[PDB]
Design a protein around this ligand. Structure first.
Ligand SMILES: Nc1nc2c(ncn2[C@@H]2O[C@H](COP(=O)(O)OP(=O)(O)O)[C@@H](O)[C@H]2O)c(=O)[nH]1
Ligand SMILES: [Mg+2]
Length: 391
């Protein structure tokens, strides 16, 4: 059983009835980053020892998989550094024999995500990519195509990492984010507000932002980032199914709507609160949204939907108070006025000593990290253009 956060450790040592999640993810991880994250999801188990997430890892290099932990070799899909090469190999025209590549994929997909009775055991797909790579980013474009060709039995969610500072990795990331933004706009004019979107959301993480948080607190920066990112997603999946409130309960259906309907960019703040004061509460909430693992200068006022919950002790006098539920409403209100959009904010109960406040904004436009990333990007391909002058 994989337990890669204090929150998950507590939960499983206290609750022995963790037998269900809010939304049944099917995790596909592509490229080394993607595989490594998928590998973690694969490790999660219910209280009764069953796997939580059916998980495939996909790659072109078999060296980016031979050292995985929780993914059976059978579930390591292999095909015998430019995003084009991935897409190209899966085109009826561009590659001659791309017929026996689509097929392998579609087969293994049915193998891992369908019943015997040809049903589907998953609610949405969670695809993991370190945008910037060749295998990874390439798979980003590939997925967007497959979604048009209605290849997937249900909606797709993308978990995407943004590169630190390699000018090539930056290019790939930008063309992908660009291609994503362009899918999202098309999706917006093809489907209504109420409608279930084929691309449910995209969750981004900034490597620069993440490395920074990590050095603040031997230790591997990506191993730590991965644990935080993945555990958070798992936690927000676990909690609404396994923890209720006497006041306001964020239940699974609420989360499902939030992850399924907005159809654009999504972000999460996880804030630990032990300091039970209105001030330091406000502060760690703000910290988690602006300088947390999921932050990338998001455009908060473009959010069409919100959600989240503060997980608190059984006698948390504080999280009962009007001003508490008022200060929270106001702190969040600074990012997006809450009376404007759909959502719900819970306050579930748990056996713990501290609390944790989870915050989610969905349906946002392109994060501004795109801009500050590009600025970097252009100002580099010029520097090459010049150094290309010399000789
Ligand atoms: N957040 C995060 N980023 C990673 C991790 N591993 C690699 N990356 C970065 O994500 C990008 C993805 O490329 P990588 O997966 O290493 O190779 P490729 O996808 O097979 O081409 C690179 O820019 C890596 O620096 C990880 O575990 N976590
Ligand atoms: Mg690789």
């Amino acid at each position: 059983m994989v337990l890669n956060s204090n929150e998950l450790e507590h939960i499983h040592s206290t609750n022995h009835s963790v037998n269900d999640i809010s939304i049944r993810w099917g995790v596909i991880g592509a490229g080394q980053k993607g595989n490594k994250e998928a590998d973690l999801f694969a490790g999660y188990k219910f209280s009764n020892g069953t796997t939580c997430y059916p998980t495939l890892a996909v790659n072109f290099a078999e060296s980016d998989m031979m050292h995985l932990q929780n993914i059976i070799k059978e579930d390591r899909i292999h095909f015998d550094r430019t995003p084009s090469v991935v897409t190209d190999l899966f085109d009826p025209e561009t590659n001659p024999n791309a017929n026996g590549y689509l097929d392998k994929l579609a087969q293994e997909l049915g193998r891992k995500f369908t019943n015997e009775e040809g049903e589907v055991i998953v609610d949405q797909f969670l695809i993991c990519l370190g945008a910037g790579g060749g295998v990874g980013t390439g798979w980003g474009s590939l997925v967007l195509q497959l979604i048009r060709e209605q290849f997937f039995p249900c909606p797709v969610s993308m978990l995407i990492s943004l590169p630190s500072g390699d000018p090539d990795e930056i290019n790939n990331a930008l063309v992908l984010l660009s291609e994503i933004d362009e899918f999202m706009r098309e999706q917006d004019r093809l489907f209504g507000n109420s409608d279930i979107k084929p691309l449910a959301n995209v969750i981004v993480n900034d490597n620069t932002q993440m490395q920074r948080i990590i050095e603040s607190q031997y230790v591997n920066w990506k191993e730590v980032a991965n644990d935080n990112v993945v555990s958070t997603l798992h936690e927000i999946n676990i909690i609404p199914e396994n923890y209720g409130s006497d006041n306001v309960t964020y239940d699974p259906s609420d989360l499902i709507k939030l992850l399924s309907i907005p159809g654009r960019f999504l972000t999460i703040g996880k804030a630990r609160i032990a300091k039970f004061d209105l001030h330091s509460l406000e502060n760690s909430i703000k910290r988690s949204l602006d300088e947390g693992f999921f932050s990338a200068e998001h455009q908060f006022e473009t959010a069409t939907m919100y959600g989240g919950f503060v997980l608190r002790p059984s006698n948390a006098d504080f999280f009962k108070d009007v001003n508490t539920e008022n200060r929270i409403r106001n702190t969040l209100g600074e990012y997006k006025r809450l009376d404007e959009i759909a959502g719900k904010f819970g306050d579930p109960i748990w056996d713990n000593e501290y609390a944790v406040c989870y915050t989610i904004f969905a349906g946002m436009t392109m994060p501004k990290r795109y801009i500050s990333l590009a600025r970097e990007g252009k100002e580099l391909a010029e520097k090459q253009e010049q150094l290309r002058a010399e000789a």
